[PDB]
Amino acid sequence: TCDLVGESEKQLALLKRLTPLFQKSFESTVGQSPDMYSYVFRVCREAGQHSSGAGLVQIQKSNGKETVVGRFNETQIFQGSNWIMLIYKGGDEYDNHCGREQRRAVVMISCNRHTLADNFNPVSEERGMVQDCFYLFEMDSSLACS
Amino acid sequence: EKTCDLVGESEKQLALLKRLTPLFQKSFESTVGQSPDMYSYVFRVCREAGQHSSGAGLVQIQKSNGKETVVGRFNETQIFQGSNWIMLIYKGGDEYDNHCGREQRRAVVMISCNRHTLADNFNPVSECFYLFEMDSSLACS
Numbered sequence: 001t002c003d004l005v006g007e008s009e010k011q012l013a014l015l016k017r018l019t020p021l022f023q024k025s026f027e028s029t030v031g032q033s034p035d036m037y038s039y040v041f042r043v044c045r046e047a048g049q050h051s052s053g054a055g056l057v058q059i060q061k062s063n064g065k066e067t068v069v070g071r072f073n074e075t076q077i078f079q080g081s082n083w084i085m086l087i088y089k090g091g092d093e094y095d096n097h098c099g100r101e102q103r104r105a106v107v108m109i110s111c112n113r114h115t116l117a118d119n120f121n122p123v124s125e126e127r128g129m130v131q132d133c134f135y136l137f138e139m140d141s142s143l144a145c146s
Numbered sequence: 147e148k149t150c151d152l153v154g155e156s157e158k159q160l161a162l163l164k165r166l167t168p169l170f171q172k173s174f175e176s177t178v179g180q181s182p183d184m185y186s187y188v189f190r191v192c193r194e195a196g197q198h199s200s201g202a203g204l205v206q207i208q209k210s211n212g213k214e215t216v217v218g219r220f221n222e223t224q225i226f227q228g229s230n231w232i233m234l235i236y237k238g239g240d241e242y243d244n245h246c247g248r249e250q251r252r253a254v255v256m257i258s259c260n261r262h263t264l265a266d267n268f269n270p271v272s273e274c275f276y277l278f279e280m281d282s283s284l285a286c287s
């Protein structure tokens with residue numbers, strides 16, 4: 001399961017508030033041909049098929065190259081008025097961008113009082129996230145409501 | 147005449163900045179903590195926040211003596227729009243003295259869609275990086 005970065009029982013409780021999503025699998029594909037990437041995200045569970053401990057991976061559809069965007073063994077989580085921010089650090093280092101630092105995944109879970117979990121997608125396409133050196137994603141969930 | 151300076155430029159982020167102009171003139175504030183250690187957070191969109199912090203977009207004010215600590219500068223701005231929320235980031239703040247590796251402070255502000263107010267309810271979420279939030283119909287789409 002998710003391992004908190006650092007004990008903030010506040011974040012611990014939050015991981016528990018999110019367990020109803022652990023077994024679900026979210027995917028979103030952005031961009032057009034030659035050039036199309038598929039993002040697979042999971043909550044405190046393996047997201048890739050060639051990785052270990054990946055929380056969110058990027059898959060180049062042209063050749064299936066799977067890049068780890070963030071790991072759930074380095075999780076951070078915060079709760080706003082009607083959203084929950086989930087962060088997965090320790091992803092693969094950029095090859096020739098953003099100072100070759102480790103990739104990081106940020107998922108903004110917005111309160112949606114009519115779905116337990118739905119509409120996951122990057123806040124991009126893949127020709128903008130790398131430019132901004134920020135993998136920002138979003139999804140809906142009543143779990144993010146308060 | 148100094149406005150937000152996009153980090154890095156990204157006509158999408160420049161458009162978002164224009165979309166947020168109605169807030170430039172407004173002032174946001176929220177106080178946390180109990181005497182005598184209360185802090186006041188002042189936030190402004192593409193304008194200066196405190197009274198003694200040039201280029202500061204968001205400042206932490208010690209209510210006891212008014213000492214200002216810069217959390218983020220609007221000349222190192224980043225902005226993203228999701229579906230029913232806009233994220234505003236201000237970097238280049240005063241570096242920590244004994245925390246986060248002396249690391250320059252950063253301000254992350256989650257502007258949530260609220261169809262019933264142009265701007266309101268600004269307050270910190272948690273105090274690395276400082277996470278804040280507020281409501282605005284401008285973040286509604």
Ligand SMILES: *[C@@H]1O[C@H](CO)[C@@H](O)[C@H](O)[C@H]1NC(C)=O
Nearest residue numbers: 003005052053071073074090
């Ligand atoms: C998280 O897992 C990665 C991959 O094995 C590893 O390199 C890193 O040291 C781990 N970090 C923690 C929190 O143990």
Ligand SMILES: O=P(O)(O)OC[C@@H](O)CO
Nearest residue numbers: 025026027117118119120
């Ligand atoms: O297709 P996504 O956006 O990943 O949502 C899947 C979820 O509805 C499965 O229960």
Ligand SMILES: O=P(O)(O)OC[C@@H](O)CO
Nearest residue numbers: 173174175265266267268
């Ligand atoms: O109290 P805050 O959150 O700073 O909002 C003030 C704003 O409503 C003034 O027009």
